[PDB]
Amino acid sequence: MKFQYKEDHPFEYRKKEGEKIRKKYPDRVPVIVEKAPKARVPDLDKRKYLVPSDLTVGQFYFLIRKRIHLRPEDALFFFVNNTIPPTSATMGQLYEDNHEEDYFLYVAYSDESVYGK
């Protein structure tokens, strides 16, 4: 897994920003959303998202898909730590199980059901 947010900011920078945003919004989670490398999906204008913890992963799927503006026939899959996250889980629940030491949740999207495919 590779993210352009890590190429732009070292860990010590990411940790300070993720630590401050979590103390300011304890009921929200910071999420980095980027396109998988070999994905044939349009790009997002923004990659840093502040998500309500009670929003489900399925609802987060639909909100990101609308921002990417996909055709109805376009497939879209999400990946957290090389695994498709559960639909019924909340973003706060997914954050607690998968956040990195910089207090960020990293999510990649692609048209393929395998991360690097």
Partner: peptide
């Protein structure tokens, strides 16, 4: 960079 707040509406 600045966070964008995600909401259902």
């Amino acid at each position: 960079s600045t966070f964008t707040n995600i909401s259902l509406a």
